[PDB]
Amino acid sequence: AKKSMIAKQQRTPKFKVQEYTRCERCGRPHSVIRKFKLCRICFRELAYKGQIPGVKKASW
């Protein structure tokens, strides 16, 4: 059961509290980064692919 409450996330809830954040490309509710509205799995995917113009594999 995923489509129903991704649709819940899409529609505005009855209170300003309830609008939790789900990742938009892949509907995981946990561990999204606000700067991309993306969660780690499908974030790392297109990160290795090349998207997200500014980010690189870091090292120091």
Binding site: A47, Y48, K49, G50, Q51, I52, P53, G54, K56, K57
Partner: peptide, 15 residues
């Protein structure tokens, strides 16, 4: 390519 992006490869999203 995930490793080579940004050093020898461009992001293919240049904005």
């Amino acid at each position: 390519v995930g490793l080579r992006i940004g050093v020898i490869r461009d992001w293919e999203s240049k904005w």
